[PDB]
């Protein structure tokens, strides 16, 4: 007769723990995001073999772009190339572009590691280096690694405020991340205050265990996660978020592939009756906010189906 | 014996209503959006305490930006500051920036309400107002409220067409929002025509019950919801959307936080061998389309499971 | 007694096939995308009745825009209009804009096919064609169809590399699209190599059965689908993606509506103390990556619920 109560205890345990008497629903979410703070750049670069001093300040109009859905981007490093006009010009001398005769490169060949189409005229470029000119923006963007000291090493001191508004369309529930009458002068910390939305980039990066400086060379993809586990019943009602973070970039890289998250960005300007761009190579840690959650109620149909399913165990106990 | 039939009536009621014999599947959607119409601006502004006249016309290339996933943005108000070059200049005189001696502000101090880094030299700025210059774009954007009559008050007269294409990967179903052969010369109205996808911004704003002019000062976050509840069975087949709207912005605000949905945008231009931007403070009502729905079929496993579950009530009625 | 074993066979078949003993979880994904390759343009255009030669090269900074969430865009065709200053000028002569007297058009009338607000002065525009000037950017963008040979017909030769990182927050599982130690020098093909993420635009368009050249006139919306069906149990563990493609654009169009996916893009520049833009009409096939998947485990509660549900059939077989 011991199993006659043991089965009951097991069904009670499962019903209380898994919340089978609750009908779960999607989440529907909208994310609002503000990145604040400024950075200051003062350093030295080697462009085209010539030393130059980069000094200045970048504010909220410089180190980001208008919000792209549930995400936001932050400048981290850049390579600048000014005054590029369409024409024919030798490209950057690499292993696949060096030539000693015009026959070395064929006109119209589009090696998937260049910018432009070659014409097949191996001319000198610099220090008697023979390469065959391509039709593209001149001067051709020299292929070089990002500077070892990240230009925006101060970017880890930035702050970000996140407002999440989730919905449960099955029920009549729509709720926000920040409750009214709550202090905003604060910072996020798992133990000190896990409800404050203000996240510190240094903090989010150090919690995962990755040093910001290392990853600032080429950037990466970061994710914040907001989990919502909301009980909509009149009793034991609570709907509150939990914050976690992790790296969506592989971090292991590969010889064929390339680490970081980088892209090239264009800025056109006509001058002297000529057209010329100012494209920049851009390394920047794109953030992806990932918000997900569940919410149940007391729909009696689920309760009935589960009770009727578990009644057979009551039967079987007497059967055996 | 009355319960013997009452149970049967309950189970039938539950099966017909909740559609337990239907295996539900999530939704995969793609949103296409077009915002049309033009606006005209003719007003007066007080910039740097000088009166100026702003007159002109904004068209689809001006009052928006390229679509960002399942969303679209509309210009509502802006504050323009032209000709800003990098250099050291006094900032806007506020409570936290006013000084009487160089000792009042320390060099390198980055108060999180400023643009640029002070050097510690409290000089006059205007009307014998001593503030200490910071290194940033000059002249420093003066902190001012948006004008009381919203520059684009005509923006409520714009129209938006929405094409939703949803998928149900579990089944072989992919459908669209607009059926072929359906008039497009129309406007949305819950009673007149709830299938026409052309929404009027004044209409969507007024349905929720918020006046456009008040929210147009600082903007906010709007959301359209498209609910799909599609029955894929041969019999009683129907798959049609329903439109609803609501405000994802808090609308209650806070003294620490700030209402509306605003951001600063940059437009760079080199002139006289100097670099200068034209950054604009932007207030604009970001729209977020939220599309969700369910679709099921006649998978017999679900039917078998439910019927076996509910058989225990038939037996318990005889038990009791 | 045959049914006594037939029922057991059916329950075993259902449990093995549908995987009822697995608790399914949603998917949380992040998409990284790279589009590579270059294009060359050399053609002739008829702008304002005058022949011109368009020759040049477009690289990764020209034929796209920064990634917008889980999507990417590719230039396909464009109509350029340079030097547009704000002022009053006659618009493009169409059926609704031609007038013979000033009374034909009323000042302040905003026909929803125009750019600018008319003033009601029917003056000559070209070849003794009388239209009434509107206040907008001049010269008014002439309404013309895209060139019959698509300018970027070579865009089908582009390659795209996709890195998908999905999560199963219910379990402790986060995985990537590309496994380590896997060749990247390859191309996608359903039979040759369905794991290589490098997709060829000509390939993706031809698999669906749509010629690239025809859709390149006005563009369209393309969709890649990545299906993940991952078994997280220790035995029979596998978690691998499958690639499919389809057209989210209607492709049937309508007289009232308009085919393709086009938008107008703005590029401002101040010159001669005047403001002027360089807005371009843009036709480009927007790509929408759609990633979805399921993953289950061996939660015993689901197993117990299903077994209890199906025990009733064991009972009913003896009942009948
Ligand atoms: C030196 C350098 N290389 C970059 N990417 N190089 C790639 C990038 C790739 S990719 O990940 O397939 O885009 C390479 C791919 C293959 N492959 O065939 O598998 C071979 C190679 S390769 O090392 O032999 O030339 C690939 C090389 C990059 C990033 O890609 P990209 O600039 O060449 O477009 C940067 C960025 O600054 C860079 O500075
Ligand atoms: C006058 C004015 N103030 C703005 N934001 N002000 C904030 C904004 C914020 S924020 O919501 O935390 O970004 C403030 C936050 C705190 N706080 O510590 O909780 C204190 C304050 S404060 O009122 O004492 O200076 C905060 C003040 C804003 C919007 O933020 P911002 O321009 O300062 O970056 C505007 C925009 O037009 C504006 O015109
Ligand atoms: C010649 C031409 N027409 C375009 N769109 N035309 C529309 C576009 C539309 S729309 O799909 O409702 O935006 C039209 C809608 C309606 N309608 O009331 O249902 C009537 C008409 S109409 O043919 O009589 O003028 C609509 C016409 C377009 C695309 O829209 P748009 O440039 O006019 O803003 C292009 C693009 O280059 C174009 O070259
Ligand atoms: C961030 O700010 C603190 C406060 O002044 C400063 O001590 C620290 O050096 C800053 N971080 C970096 C990387 O400079
Ligand atoms: C918020 O924080 C401030 C100081 O940071 C403190 O004085 C105040 O009591 C806190 N609570 C409220 C409700 O302001
Ligand atoms: C919207 O257009 C109508 C039609 O002319 C006009 O009466 C109304 O004033 C416009 N809205 C605003 C805010 O001007
Ligand atoms: C559409 O509307 C027009 C007028 O708005 C009307 O003449 C026509 O009959 C309607 N139906 C169709 C199919 O065009
Ligand atoms: C794509 O590249 C191949 C390889 O040279 C070439 O034969 C083909 O013509 C190119 N496609 C187009 C549309 O030109
Ligand atoms: C990858 O491909 C290259 C040639 O495309 C081949 O030589 C090599 O064996 C392949 N495998 C690895 C692991 O490199």
Numbering used by the authors:
A (entry chain C), B (entry chain B), C (entry chain A): 31 to 350
Which statements did the authors publish about this structure?
P2X receptors are the family of cation channels activated by extracellular ATP and are widely expressed in the mammalian nervous, respiratory, reproductive, and immune systems. There are seven subtypes (P2X1-P2X7) in the family, each of which plays distinct roles in physiological and pathophysiological functions via homo- or heterotrimerization. The overall structures are similar and show the trimeric architecture of P2X receptors, consisting of the extracellular domain and two transmembrane (TM) helices, with each protomer resembling the dolphin shape, consistent with the previously reported P2X structures (Sheng and Hattori, 2022).
More importantly, we identified the residual EM densities at the agonist binding site that fit into the shape of PPNDS and PPADS. It should be noted that while the pyridoxal phosphate groups in PPNDS and PPADS are shared, the naphthylazo group of PPNDS is significantly bulkier than the azophenyl group of PPADS. Interestingly, despite the structural differences between PPNDS and PPADS, the two common sulfonic acid groups form hydrogen bonds with the side chains of the same residues in the receptor, Lys66 and Gln143. The overall structures were stable during the simulations, and PPNDS remained stably bound to the receptor. Consequently, there was no structural change in the lower body domain or associated gating motion of the TM domain. Comparison with the previously reported apo- (closed) and ATP-bound (open) structures showed that, in contrast to ATP binding, the binding of PPNDS and PPADS does not induce the downward motion of the left flipper, which is essential for channel activation.
